[PDB]
Design a binder for this molecule. Structure first.
Ligand SMILES: [Mg+2]
Length: 233
């Protein structure tokens, strides 16, 4: 059902309201996704002024329905199956030796646009730790997002660790725990264990004076046992 909404290019809107250690801010993003290619193109603007945390710390919060699910794994794509009514996605992001973010997002269609609306709350950050001291490089490593079914919730959970490069050559770890639950009452796909292989490239718009982030991302599902190789023998 839901997967049919993702055969072409879909416009995306992202709206985030944040509070980190009492620093309030908002981010708006616009772009498009084409799940056929696992591909996202988005530009984000801090609409309140200067962003009080580094942009890379917000990438995971700022639409896994655009992941490319290989045909042989189509029955494992929770995210699209929940559309158009959508899902709630919640995360706890624990920065090693530092504070944490808690996020709540609703991801659904509004007309023909896929919208991601987020509230983010950060607490217990160190004033001159890597986050509030802005010591993170403006770049982004590749990762895997490990998904498991959460039958009790008619949804999924995921766990993964983000490695953020620090300007002195060290790494800041950000442990992620996620849960997704459908908003609608219809049936969804409950997957076998698998992962999403993610890659994200961060850049700047040379004509933009606001604080912003341009993002190119590719996400591909993997990790499910297939017998396809035997076709070629
Ligand atoms: Mg306290």
């Amino acid at each position: 059902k839901g997967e049919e909404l993702f055969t072409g290019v879909v416009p995306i809107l992202v709206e985030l309201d944040g509070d980190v250690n009492g620093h309030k801010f908002s981010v708006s993003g616009e772009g498009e996704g084409d799940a056929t290619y696992g591909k996202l193109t988005l530009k984000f603007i801090c609409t309140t002024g200067k962003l009080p945390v580094p942009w890379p710390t917000l990438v995971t919060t700022l639409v896994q329905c655009f992941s490319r699910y290989p045909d042989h794994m189509k029955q494992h794509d929770f995210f699209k199956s929940a559309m158009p009514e959508g899902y709630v996605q919640e995360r706890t992001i624990s920065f090693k030796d530092d504070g944490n973010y808690k996020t709540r997002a609703e991801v659904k269609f509004e007309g023909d646009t896929l919208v991601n609306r987020i509230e983010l709350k950060g607490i217990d950050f160190k004033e001159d730790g890597n986050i509030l001291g802005h010591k993170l490089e403006y770049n982004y490593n590749s990762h895997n997002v490990y998904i498991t079914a959460d039958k009790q919730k008619n949804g999924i959970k995921a766990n993964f660790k983000i490695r953020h490069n620090i300007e002195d050559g060290s790494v800041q770890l950000a442990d992620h725990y996620q849960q997704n639950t459908p908003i609608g009452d219809g049936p969804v796909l409950l997957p076998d264990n698998h992962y999403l292989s993610t890659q994200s490239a961060l850049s700047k718009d040379p004509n933009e004076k606001r604080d912003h982030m341009v993002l190119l991302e590719f996400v591909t599902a993997a990790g499910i046992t297939h017998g396809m190789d035997e076709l070629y023998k």
